[PDB]
Amino acid sequence: MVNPTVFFDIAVDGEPLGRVSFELFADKVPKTAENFRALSTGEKGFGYKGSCFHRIIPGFMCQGGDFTRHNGTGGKSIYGEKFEDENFILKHTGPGILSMANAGPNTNGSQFFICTAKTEWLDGKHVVFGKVKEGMNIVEAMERFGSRNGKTSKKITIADCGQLE
Helix, strand or coil: CCCEEEEEEEECCCCCEEEEEECCCCCCCCHHHHHHHHHHCCCCCCCCCCCCCEEEEEECCCECCCCCCCCCCCCCCCCCCEEEECCCCCCCCCCEEEEEECCCCCCCCCCCEEEEECHHHHCCCCEEEEEEEEHHHHHHHCCCCCCCCCCCCCEEEEEEEEEEE
16 A cells, blocks of 8 residues: 655765665556566566666766666566556656656666656656655765766666665
């Protein structure tokens, strides 16, 4: 009944930075929320622990979740390699929105992005499924390691992750 909460502990070149936590909107996009929750706990035998944020663009977003190829070309879901766009009820309203990356219609895997600005042009094309709860200061600190082309100047990693409660 209560929407689940998950955390990421972030590191910069192996040195601890801080924790970001997320509300997942299981009430509105249960299938997409469940995928991200299970990849965060690792309970299926694979997931986000140890993976990096491969593309960070200040004034746009931070993208990660590619645990198979580490560069933005891979990842997989708990349902198979890809799954469908569940719905587009929720919109890209501003900083802290959590949304699925994709390669065309019905191509969700494990890659996701955290918005650092309003990205309204993505409405109806990328499935919104959560938001940052605590630690937006940590997301802003991560964003300072990005660049115009998205290459990071230090390695930004999910050192640990899981579910809170």
